[PDB]
Design a protein around this ligand. Structure first.
Ligand SMILES: [Cl-]
Lengths: 117, 117, 117, 116
């Protein structure tokens, strides 16, 4: 299905398989903060999106808690990827690790847990 | 006052003062996910903006780690507010709590820590 | 009321009520790390205990994700308290905030979420 | 020597640049009311590896840590905390610590420090 928010940010799904996903995007001018780098929310949205698709492969679920650790800033024009991998799958919950990468560099690390419906 | 990303999302600054900030927004059609509710990326972007604004009132700061806990889903039309308050202020770091509220209900809770440049 | 690990650490229950709890303890010689201050694991154990006690007032539950933000170091002798309050209560999950306080100073901030059985 | 690690009976199995492994056994004084390993015990194990790993880069103080619980452990269970560096910057560093018991991922810990 088409995700309005994902489309609004211009995010693309490069890979989607059981328990994993890769979403890509480009930092545009409308994604910057006052400092001129990619807004923390744009990077998080990229990761959150991969996280969402990967967990949906396991069935309907709702995110509970997510953590985002920022390591490197990205400037406008930067191409970035969110790579989601399943860390734990239980009957009622699941956790995923999402690496935000740009040109071989680990830009940020995302951890998210969902509640399986 | 707002940055390019906040502008793209329709987020507005309602208040800013030392150690705190209030940002408001409304859930629009382009903020929804596959399932029709506010995309987690939107809610986080709102909280992250209040977090960033409040943290910078103490001087240039860069985000290190953030946590987002989701409690209630929101649909199109929902008016939402992110309220940031300073929890701890040290010479090199600071932590903020950001409550995301809609119609008197706590929608999500955000905690963020910055490195003070 | 008290826990076997709480007992081993010398932690005591000062207060319990619906959705809340207060646990108290003192930093002993066996709670310090190589550098002479309270070990991060001790402060977390303290907060985690108050968290576990508060959530169980709503029924049995199992912890899913917890965050611990450290603000101030504590030395041997310090009287400390973990104060847990309910932030969100849903049918299947609940989240709590736990403030670790010592002599009126916020030493650490803990956030924890559980799955209700 | 770490007094708290000693008190919990934690042992350092490996220490190298930016990494560490700490081991321990769930004893009767490490349980919760449910009869399983107290969340605080599992965390102390991970936090210990985290601390040892980060301090190989220089004196540092923990800022924020996350602990995700996946499986419960019973008394007598042998557990390990394996710390690896995920990011190293001039002022901060982040580590991933896996808590393992009998080949199973019991918990995942993420921690960031401020390098003094
Ligand atoms: Cl977290």
């Amino acid at each position: 299905m088409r995700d309005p928010f994902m489309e609004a940010l211009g995010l693309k799904v490069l890979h989607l398989a059981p328990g994993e996903a890769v979403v890509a995007g480009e930092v545009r001018a409308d994604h910057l903060n006052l400092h001129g780098t990619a807004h923390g929310g744009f990077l998080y949205a990229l990761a959150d999106s991969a996280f969402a698709l990967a967990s949906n492969t396991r069935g309907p679920a709702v995110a509970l808690s997510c953590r985002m650790d920022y390591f490197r800033p990205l400037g406008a024009g930067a191409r970035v990827e969110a790579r989601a991998v399943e860390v734990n799958l239980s009957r009622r919950t699941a956790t995923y690790r999402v690496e935000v990468v740009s040109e071989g560099k680990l830009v940020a690390l995302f951890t998210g847990t969902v509640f399986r419906l």
